[PDB]
Design a protein around this ligand. Structure first.
Ligand SMILES: C[C@@]1(O)OC[C@H](O)C1(O)O
Ligand code: MET
Ligand SMILES: [Zn+2]
Ligand SMILES: [Zn+2]
Lengths: 172, 167
């Protein structure tokens, strides 16, 4: 409810961190959602097995690097377009702090030796327990480290009024 | 989900709502993450295009029916296993309130007439704008209404010490 942002995916750079939305709780705590954009929109997508395995690993490793000093992660979830994840948290860490934690978590993916070190990979604890690939998760993580992580600007990427009009007044 | 309840997927009923996590905030507010389980674990899955199209519709429709009266949705995002969505929100609505909102939102999906009506479905606003199917999204929605929405219990579904040892 403070700011959410309509940004232009045709100009979006990746890998990148961007503040997607800021909200406040009734007693005034800040909640921030970050766009952790792994793939360039409409050019690249993550594979379904590797995104799922990465999901099992990512929020744990992000918590290890990012929690504390005014930040408590709520959830990290995949985007339905398979180009990134949204991470919701209590606090207002800056984008570079988030990027650095993200890269450290990617590096942590690469030291996963085998599937027995993937948390919850079994029929009791995973909804689709065959839909997994450590090697694809590690390919994703390696890609992020090879490409580095940029900080994207909501001002730069903002869709102007006119364009949002053109798009929204085709939705009816 | 980070810091989740360790529940037994092999016994989880679906469609169902479940409290997946609760958190406090520094000045004392509450956050709740709900497991919106569409598919029976390891028996059914949603198709990738339909889940994506549903993601585009669901947030909006859910806010229509659920926001207000001590609740503000943060995010509704798909699960990587494609069996459900996690909904994070500020507040502590009961499970049945959430189930009622969810069904109303599914009914809303069914009145979408064409793909052009779907918010943000275009190259400017979607990361994978070809990966969409309104018909799959409506099939999903219809299945929820046909099956109804149960409330699942973390106490009922808790994995026992002996099983967690086995794991
Ligand atoms: C939405 C989703 O769960 O389905 C396809 C993608 O794999 C996903 O985002 O992880
Ligand atoms: C191991 S369950 C993890 C939930 C996941 N981080 C999501 O929010 O979709
Ligand atoms: Zn899983
Ligand atoms: Zn999309």
């Amino acid at each position: 409810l403070l700011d959410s942002f309509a940004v232009d995916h045709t100009r979006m750079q990746a890998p990148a961190v961007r503040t997607a939305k800021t909200m406040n709780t009734p007693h005034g705590d800040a909640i921030t959602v970050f766009d952790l954009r792994f793939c360039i929109p409409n050019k690249e997508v993550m594979p379904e097995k590797g995104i799922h395995t990465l999901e099992h690993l990512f929020a744990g490793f992000m918590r290890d690097h990012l929690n504390g000093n005014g930040v408590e992660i709520i959830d990290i979830s995949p985007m339905g377009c398979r180009t990134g994840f949204y991470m919701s948290l209590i606090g207002t860490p800056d984008e570079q702090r988030v990027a650095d934690a993200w890269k450290a978590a990617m590096a942590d993916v690469l030291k996963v030796q085998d599937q027995n070190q993937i948390p919850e990979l079994n029929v009791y604890q995973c909804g689709t327990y065959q839909m997994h690939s450590l090697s694809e998760a590690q390919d994703i993580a390696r890609h992020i480290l090879e490409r580095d992580v940029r900080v994207n600007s909501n001002k730069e990427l903002a869709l102007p009024k006119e364009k949002l009009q053109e798009l929204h007044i085709l939705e009816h």
